[PDB]
């Protein structure tokens with residue numbers, strides 16, 4: 261029985277609706293559980309889903325130690341990390357990633373019918389307010405960016421005690437709906453939102469690029485085996501099917 | 511020395527301008543040549559560039575036999591494939607790809623300041639005409655697309671909306687109420703030379719170019735790590751603006 265570390269994140273991993281207490285894997289549902297089920301069928305394994313105790317994806321601290329799902333893999337307390345775990349340079353040094361089951365990037369959430377076309381257009385004015393989730397990977401991107409357009413945007417975002425920023429995605433979406441505000445976040449989030457709000461849309465293309473992949477400890481045999489399975493699922497069109505099932509609104 | 515197979519394709523790989531005949535790697539320049547240089551300064555290796563003899567990227571015939579750069583990697587006549595090589599399922603069965611060093615696809619070239627936000631908006635109206643260059647890669651997509659929103663667009667392109675080359679499509683946009691559907695690379699080209707035009711929305715039929723290695727290559731993981739390092743450093747973006 262494999263130990264699968266994961267994290268609550270709509271619509272990847274969610275508590276299953278019930279009128280009676282549930283136990284084990286039946287407690288959870290979502291894109292990642294459907295993915296995991298398929299993985300266990302193709303590769304032939306038993307698995308137990310365990311939410312990461314600290315509720316974090318994985319980062320380094322001041323002392324240089326890891327936490328979250330990344331740490332659970334490193335310490336071999338989990339065989340697989342099946343969650344929207346971002347494939348990054350720093351993580352690739354301590355854990356292994358399969359082929360990304362999903363590709364994405366930073367983009368713009370805003371209203372329909374407006375003349376705004378791109379990040380370029382947001383940066384050249386101060387009327388339409390814009391920002392991102394505080395201390396998220398999107399804010400970090402703009403914070404470190406040496407691109408002139410994104411430097412101008414960051415200087416704006418951080419001005420006036422960072423009032424343009426928001427606490428989380430839910431707050432950000434609400435701000436977009438209620439005020440004249442454009443939110444910067446992952447294209448996966450934006451589509452989840454736009455499918456459930458018919459007067460919102462994505463503006464422009466992807467600002468950066470990365471992927472979500474299944475994480476394994478370094479040197480694990482499951483790394484190659486999952487990549488093979490994901491390729492098969494991609495070829496069958498099942499990955500597109502799975503995304504459609506959980507992303508569509510009504 | 512590592513043998514690097516590649517293919518001529520502007521502006522990834524091009525012949526270097528010269529008064530005299532050039533030799534070796536200096537014969538070539540472009541986006542992929544810069545990437546190859548940076549990759550060699552991260553991993554640390556020597557390399558010899560060799561154009562794929564048949565001039566093909568890599569496809570399979572009726573017997574399932576491969577050609578092009580893909581075949582060169584299979585036969586171990588090349589250690590790396592640094593080129594605009596599309597990451598596809600059938601290719602991933604026989605060779606290894608790194609993480610994409612470039613993401614592209616189909617998008618819309620149109621005017622600035624308009625209420626148009628996506629391909630969906632064009633598909634649900636008719637006043638603004640839209641199309642693509644005939645029998646181009648963009649056209650081939652919409653045809654063999656079993657996605658109705660793109661089928662409905664193709665139905666409208668089939669009713670004149672198509673153009674001969676990218677050069678006609680550009681001017682047709684500038685002069686008429688027309689939206690041009692083309693590869694995102696060709697768009698970035700145009701929008702830099704025409705300040706009144708812009709890309710509308712994101713990518714359609716999105717795909718990635720990855721570095722190719724033979725299956726079981728010891729450079730695989732190293733290349734992926736290097737590319738991650740390069741894009742997160744923002745050097746891949748810088749390389750793009752340099753050659754586009």
Ligand SMILES: N[C@@H](CCc1ccc2[nH]c(=O)c(=O)[nH]c2c1)C(=O)O
Nearest residue numbers: 269270317318344345346446448449
């Ligand atoms: N809701 C968004 C992103 C979810 C999300 C939020 C924070 C993350 N932090 C990490 O460190 C990581 O690897 N992945 C993460 C994914 C979506 O639906 O794609």
Ligand SMILES: N[C@@H](CCc1ccc2[nH]c(=O)c(=O)[nH]c2c1)C(=O)O
Nearest residue numbers: 519520521567568594595596693695
């Ligand atoms: N001109 C465009 C795309 C170049 C291009 C054209 C045909 C291809 N055919 C393949 O099979 C393949 O793998 N890559 C290919 C790349 C650009 O500048 O990016």
Ligand SMILES: [Cl-]
Nearest residue numbers: 427428429430
């Ligand atoms: Cl919260």
